[PDB]
Amino acid sequence: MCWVMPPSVFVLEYYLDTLWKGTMLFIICLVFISCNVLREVKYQETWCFPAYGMVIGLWLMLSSIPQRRLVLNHTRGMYHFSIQGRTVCQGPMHLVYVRLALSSDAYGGRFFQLVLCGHKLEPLVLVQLSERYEQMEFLGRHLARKLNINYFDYLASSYRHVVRHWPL
Amino acid sequence: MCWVMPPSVFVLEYYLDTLWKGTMLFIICLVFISCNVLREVKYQETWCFPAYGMVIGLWLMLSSIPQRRLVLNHTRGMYHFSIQGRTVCQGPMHLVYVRLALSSDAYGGRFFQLVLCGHKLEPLVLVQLSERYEQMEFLGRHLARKLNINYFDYLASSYRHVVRHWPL
Amino acid sequence: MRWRDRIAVLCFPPGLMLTVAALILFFIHMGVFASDVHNFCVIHNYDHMSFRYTVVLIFSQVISIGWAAMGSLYAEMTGDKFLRCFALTILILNGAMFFNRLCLEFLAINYREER
Amino acid sequence: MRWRDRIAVLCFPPGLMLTVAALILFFIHMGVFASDVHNFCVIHNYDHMSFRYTVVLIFSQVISIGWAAMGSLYAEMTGDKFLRCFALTILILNGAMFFNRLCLEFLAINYREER
Ligand SMILES: CC(C)CCC[C@@H](C)[C@H]1CC[C@H]2[C@@H]3CC=C4C[C@@H](O)CC[C@]4(C)[C@H]3CC[C@]12C
Ligand SMILES: CC(C)CCC[C@@H](C)[C@H]1CC[C@H]2[C@@H]3CC=C4C[C@@H](O)CC[C@]4(C)[C@H]3CC[C@]12C
Q1: Which residues lie on this side of the membrane: Extracellular (chains C, D)?
Q2: I want to staple B60 with a disulfide (CB 3.0 to 4.6 A). Which of B22, B76, B155, D12 is the partner?
């Protein structure tokens, strides 16, 4: 998987995982429906917490996302924000970035994620591996080989980050 | 009145008459509620018809309107659709017109109205007097003396209608 | 333009409230129909049927169909297929519900009173 | 942009989900609160009280408070005063609602059951 994804021939495509979340919610609540706890001695029925499960899940299935794509094809594409059907965002450069983001807890442990910044764009969250910096800029270099745009690091410009287009 | 409103120093202001319809609906319900007809021998209760009346009357009363105005100030004003609070329509000329409109019944009687045409503008309905053509272009020439834009007749251009600004 | 301000104050967009009136009308009429069917089938509580409110809610039905239809007419010329599909689907379900309630009212005729 | 297409399919504008959910929660909770005060004041048929569902609607109350606050926090950054006023008003009415129903429940102790 280390070599397959860096090229991303022409377009990229993307999706969301709220369908997964609603899926185990639906499984859990269907389990809850049949043979729940019998707490009539508690002078209360707890069937309405699954009713909220119904509501939350049905709303989450109401968020369907077909193949979030852009105009990232290896050409003079404008990175217009493209969905099957409707289209919303357009822009001549200066909005699409790839930025490193950091999060911290009370103890001080640092967690590193990546976000394809833009007008209502999709992130670049890696698959559950964030404890060390490893190589960082190499993936930005592969993105640069793709359609060189940006590679933004934490805080301000300073150093250690790369830009390709600027509106001055 | 013939020398008061056609002058119209600077801005004009306008309103709707739906407040009257709402207040008459409230009046007729205050008539109905106390001692209505007693048709229990009809095996029916007729209290829900005024419930619908108050639904539509409260909706009509909710249509509040502070002084629909424009930039008809006797200057190089660009005729921006102005409302106390929010503002919607802005346009550099070629959209504000004053047009004659015609209506006909089955017999063939003609009813004449006037409309200040534009992007969600207000009309120029005269006070319940349209049986003869009378003077036609006199009020159009008064509007021309005010802030000369247009006076549009029925059908196509042909003749007998006046323009001052054209977008080509 | 700013639909926050369009939905905020002083007005509504053209149409788009006739449709929501049709929605709440369809909701409450489905509630009434479900109550009638539930009370007719099992529990047999002819005292507490809607045998008393008969013609007013039928007039409500017909003004609901008229409002939905003329709202569809008022929203058709926007040039967008989604609004037309929404209005036509609401018209279809309103007509189907009216016909279903008319059939139920005609079937349950020996249960109200005699003239 | 095209708010027709924004409200049509596949998503909703950010925020304005939790606010509408809090509105419908407010509606159903005025329904049950009005039923409770009605049956506590006049008709006196405590067997059909909401003496049976007592903690799940309290949980619904606090989660509705949380969602109203969370939607207010998520919609404050729009830069528009109308949205902030909307969110603050719905939060205030929900909170005063919660205090009122808590006071009513605390007044209605001697009528439920005894441990
Ligand atoms: C799940 C989220 C959206 C909250 C929804 C709560 C609903 C399901 C709850 C809250 C209030 C409840 C009602 C409160 C009072 C009554 C009257 C009682 O004699 C029988 C139960 C009945 C008819 C309840 C039915 C279920 C009910 C409507
Ligand atoms: C917006 C309004 C005007 C349209 C809907 C009309 C409303 C007010 C009407 C139509 C259906 C009606 C209900 C139909 C059935 C029942 C059961 C009956 O045994 C007592 C009256 C009751 C509880 C009615 C109360 C009033 C009601 C809800």
Answers
A1: 39-51, 108-115
A2: B22
